[PDB]
PDB file of C-alpha atoms in Angstrom:
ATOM      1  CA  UNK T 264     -65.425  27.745  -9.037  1.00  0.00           C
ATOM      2  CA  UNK T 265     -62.580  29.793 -10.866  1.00  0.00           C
ATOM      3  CA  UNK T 266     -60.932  29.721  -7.468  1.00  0.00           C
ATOM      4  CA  UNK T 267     -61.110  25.655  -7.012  1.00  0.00           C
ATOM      5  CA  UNK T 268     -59.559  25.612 -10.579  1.00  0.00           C
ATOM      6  CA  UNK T 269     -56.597  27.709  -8.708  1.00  0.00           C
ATOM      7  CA  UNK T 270     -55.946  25.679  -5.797  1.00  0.00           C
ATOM      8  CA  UNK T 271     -55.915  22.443  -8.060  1.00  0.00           C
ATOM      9  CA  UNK T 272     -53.354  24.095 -10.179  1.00  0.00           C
ATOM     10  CA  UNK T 273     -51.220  25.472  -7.002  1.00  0.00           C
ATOM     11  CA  UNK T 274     -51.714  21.607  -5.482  1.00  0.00           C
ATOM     12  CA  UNK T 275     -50.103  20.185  -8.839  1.00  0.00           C
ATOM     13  CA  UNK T 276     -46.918  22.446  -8.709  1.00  0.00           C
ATOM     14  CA  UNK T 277     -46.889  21.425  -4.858  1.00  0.00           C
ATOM     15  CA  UNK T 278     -46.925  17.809  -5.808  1.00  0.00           C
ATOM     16  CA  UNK T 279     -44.137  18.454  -8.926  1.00  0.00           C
ATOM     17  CA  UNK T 280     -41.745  20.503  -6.302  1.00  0.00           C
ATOM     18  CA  UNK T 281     -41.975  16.871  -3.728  1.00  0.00           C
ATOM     19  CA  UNK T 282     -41.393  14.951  -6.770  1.00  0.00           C
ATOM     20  CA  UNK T 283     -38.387  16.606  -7.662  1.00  0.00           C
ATOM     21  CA  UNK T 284     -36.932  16.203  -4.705  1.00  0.00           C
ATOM     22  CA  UNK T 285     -37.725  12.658  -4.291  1.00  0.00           C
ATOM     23  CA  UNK T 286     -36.344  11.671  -7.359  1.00  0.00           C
ATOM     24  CA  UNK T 287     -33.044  13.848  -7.057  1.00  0.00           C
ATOM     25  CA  UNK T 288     -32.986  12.558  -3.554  1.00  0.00           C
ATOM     26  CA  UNK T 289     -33.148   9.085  -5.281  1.00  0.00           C
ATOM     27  CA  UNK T 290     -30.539   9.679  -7.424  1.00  0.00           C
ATOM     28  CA  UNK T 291     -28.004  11.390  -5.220  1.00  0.00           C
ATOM     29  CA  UNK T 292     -29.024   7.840  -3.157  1.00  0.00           C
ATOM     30  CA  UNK T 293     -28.050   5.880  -5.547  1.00  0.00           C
ATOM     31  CA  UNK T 294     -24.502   7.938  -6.655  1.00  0.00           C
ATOM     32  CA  UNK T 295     -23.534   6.884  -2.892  1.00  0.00           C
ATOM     33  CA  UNK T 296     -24.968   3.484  -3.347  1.00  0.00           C
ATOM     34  CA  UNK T 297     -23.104   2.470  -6.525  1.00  0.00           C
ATOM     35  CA  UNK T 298     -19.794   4.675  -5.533  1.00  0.00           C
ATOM     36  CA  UNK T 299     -19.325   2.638  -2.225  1.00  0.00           C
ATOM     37  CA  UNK T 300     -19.968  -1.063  -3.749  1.00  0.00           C
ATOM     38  CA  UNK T 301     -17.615  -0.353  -6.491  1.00  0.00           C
ATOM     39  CA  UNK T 302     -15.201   1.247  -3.845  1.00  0.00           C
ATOM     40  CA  UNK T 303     -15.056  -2.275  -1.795  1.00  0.00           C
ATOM     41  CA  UNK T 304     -15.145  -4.435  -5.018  1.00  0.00           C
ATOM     42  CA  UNK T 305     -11.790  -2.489  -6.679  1.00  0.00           C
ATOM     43  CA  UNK T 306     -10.347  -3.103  -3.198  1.00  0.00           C
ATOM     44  CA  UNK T 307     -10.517  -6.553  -2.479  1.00  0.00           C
ATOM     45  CA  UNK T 308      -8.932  -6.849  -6.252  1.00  0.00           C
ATOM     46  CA  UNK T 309      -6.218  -4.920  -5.078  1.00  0.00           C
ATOM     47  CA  UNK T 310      -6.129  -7.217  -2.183  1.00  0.00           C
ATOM     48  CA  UNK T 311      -6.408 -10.370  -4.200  1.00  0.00           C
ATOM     49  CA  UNK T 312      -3.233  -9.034  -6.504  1.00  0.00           C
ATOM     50  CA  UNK T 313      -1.076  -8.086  -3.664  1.00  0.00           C
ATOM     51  CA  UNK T 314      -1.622 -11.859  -1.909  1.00  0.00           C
ATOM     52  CA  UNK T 315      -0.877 -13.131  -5.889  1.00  0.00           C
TER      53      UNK T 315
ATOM     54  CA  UNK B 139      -1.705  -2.546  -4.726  1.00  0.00           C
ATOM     55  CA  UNK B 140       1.591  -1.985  -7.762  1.00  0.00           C
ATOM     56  CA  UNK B 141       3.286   0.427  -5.121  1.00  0.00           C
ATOM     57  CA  UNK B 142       3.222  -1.883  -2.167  1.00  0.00           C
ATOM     58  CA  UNK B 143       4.092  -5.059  -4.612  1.00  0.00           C
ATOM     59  CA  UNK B 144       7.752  -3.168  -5.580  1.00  0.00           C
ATOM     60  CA  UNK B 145       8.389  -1.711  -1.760  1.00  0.00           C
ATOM     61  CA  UNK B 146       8.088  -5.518  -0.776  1.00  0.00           C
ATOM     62  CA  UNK B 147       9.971  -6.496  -3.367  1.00  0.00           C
ATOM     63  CA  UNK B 148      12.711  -4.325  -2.072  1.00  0.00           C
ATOM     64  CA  UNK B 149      12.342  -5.235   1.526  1.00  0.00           C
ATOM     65  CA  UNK B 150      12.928  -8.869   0.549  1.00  0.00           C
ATOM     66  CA  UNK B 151      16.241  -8.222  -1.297  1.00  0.00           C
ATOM     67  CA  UNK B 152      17.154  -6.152   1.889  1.00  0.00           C
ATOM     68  CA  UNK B 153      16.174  -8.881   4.272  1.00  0.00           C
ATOM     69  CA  UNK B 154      18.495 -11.131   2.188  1.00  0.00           C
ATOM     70  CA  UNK B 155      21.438  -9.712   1.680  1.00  0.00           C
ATOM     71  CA  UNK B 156      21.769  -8.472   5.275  1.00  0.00           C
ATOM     72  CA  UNK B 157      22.431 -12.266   5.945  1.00  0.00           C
ATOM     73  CA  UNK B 158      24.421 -12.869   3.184  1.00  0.00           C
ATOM     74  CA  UNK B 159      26.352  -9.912   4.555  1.00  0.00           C
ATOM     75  CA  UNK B 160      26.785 -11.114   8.377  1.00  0.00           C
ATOM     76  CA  UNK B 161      27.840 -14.226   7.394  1.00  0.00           C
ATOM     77  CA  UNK B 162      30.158 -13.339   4.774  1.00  0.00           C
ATOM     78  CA  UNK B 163      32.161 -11.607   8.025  1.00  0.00           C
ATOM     79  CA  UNK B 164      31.365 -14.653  10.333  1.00  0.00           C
ATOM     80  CA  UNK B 165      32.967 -16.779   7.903  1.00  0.00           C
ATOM     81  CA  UNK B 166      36.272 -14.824   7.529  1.00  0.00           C
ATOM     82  CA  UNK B 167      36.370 -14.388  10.825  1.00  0.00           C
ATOM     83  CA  UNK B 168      36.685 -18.359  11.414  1.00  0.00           C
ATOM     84  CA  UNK B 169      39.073 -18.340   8.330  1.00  0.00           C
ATOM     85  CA  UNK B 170      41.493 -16.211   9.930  1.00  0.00           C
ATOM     86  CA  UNK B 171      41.530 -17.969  13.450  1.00  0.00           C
ATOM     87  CA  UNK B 172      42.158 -20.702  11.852  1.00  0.00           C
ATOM     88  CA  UNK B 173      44.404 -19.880   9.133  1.00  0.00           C
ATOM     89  CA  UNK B 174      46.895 -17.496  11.451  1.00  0.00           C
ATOM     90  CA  UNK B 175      50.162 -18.468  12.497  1.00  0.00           C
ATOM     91  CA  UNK B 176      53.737 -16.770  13.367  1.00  0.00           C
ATOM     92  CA  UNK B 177      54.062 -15.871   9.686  1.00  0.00           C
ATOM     93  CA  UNK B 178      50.793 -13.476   9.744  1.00  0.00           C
ATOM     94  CA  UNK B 179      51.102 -12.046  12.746  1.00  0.00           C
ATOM     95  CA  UNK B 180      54.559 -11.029  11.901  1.00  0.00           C
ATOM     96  CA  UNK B 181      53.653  -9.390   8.649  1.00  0.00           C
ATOM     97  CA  UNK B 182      50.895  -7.565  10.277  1.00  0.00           C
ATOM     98  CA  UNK B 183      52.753  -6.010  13.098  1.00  0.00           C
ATOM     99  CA  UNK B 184      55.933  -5.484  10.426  1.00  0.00           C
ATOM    100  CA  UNK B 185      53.500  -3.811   7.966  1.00  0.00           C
ATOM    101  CA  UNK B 186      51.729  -1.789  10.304  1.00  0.00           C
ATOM    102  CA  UNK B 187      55.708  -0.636  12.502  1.00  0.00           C
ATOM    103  CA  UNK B 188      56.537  -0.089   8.668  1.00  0.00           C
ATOM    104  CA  UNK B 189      53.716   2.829   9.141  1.00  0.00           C
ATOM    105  CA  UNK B 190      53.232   3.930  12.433  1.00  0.00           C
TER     106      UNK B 190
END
């Protein structure tokens, strides 16, 4: 029994490692995601005062 | 976007007064053909013997 209890403690710390990753996966995502729309959005302001 | 607004600023005042500069010659270039006569030609060619 003692050695079930082990494997379900090694299993959570497996599951918490993915998790981590996901979310800073996620996140790093996301930095790219917001970064690039505000990228286009400054630029066709730029492109709307140069026409003005 | 503010840089290229001032270069084309400055390209248009170029662009203008290269015509206002061709035609300033142009136009005293018909003055003179039509405003020469014995009288100029003789000054010129006295003024410039007066130097040679």
């Amino acid at each position: 029994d003692l050695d079930l209890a082990k494997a379900s403690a090694t299993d959570q710390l497996k599951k918490a490692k993915a998790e981590a990753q996901v979310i800073i996966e996620q996140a790093n995502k996301r930095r790219s995601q917001i970064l690039d729309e505000a990228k286009a959005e400054a630029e066709q302001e730029r492109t709307k005062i140069v026409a003005q | 976007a503010q840089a290229e607004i001032e270069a084309e600023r400055k390209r248009a005042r170029e662009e203008l007064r290269k015509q206002v500069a061709i035609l300033a010659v142009a136009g005293a270039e018909k003055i003179i053909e039509r405003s020469v006569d014995e009288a100029a030609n003789s000054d010129i060619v006295d003024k410039l013997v007066a130097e040679l």
